[PDB]
Amino acid sequence: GALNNAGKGMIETNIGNYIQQQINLLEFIKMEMADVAGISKQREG
Amino acid sequence: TLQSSHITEWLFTIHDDVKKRALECFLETAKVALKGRNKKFQ
C-alpha cells in the first residue's frame, strides 16, 4: 500500500542554513576587523 | 554623516587638484590668446 499513498518525497538539501552560517561568520569578522583598527561603524559615518 | 563623507573625501581632494591645474593651464592659454589680435579681450 505504499504505491497508492505515503506522499511525494523531496530531494531537499539544507544549504539555506549553511548559507546563513557563512553570512553570520562574514558579519563577525568584519566587526572583528573593525575593532582591531579602532574604526567602528560609528567611525565610518 | 560627517564621517561617511570622509570615506569619499580622498576622491575629492585629488579632483580639486585637477580643477586647480586645469584652471592654471587655461589661464596661460588665455594669456597667449591676448597677443593674437582678438577684439573680444577688450
Swiss-Prot record, chain B:
This is Portal protein. The chain holds residues 564 to 605 of 806 of the full protein. Forms the portal vertex of the capsid. Probably involved in head assembly, genome packaging, tail attachment, and genome ejection. It is found in: Virion. Homododecamer. Interacts with the Cargo protein 1. Interacts with the major capsid protein. It comes from Bacteroides phage crAss001.
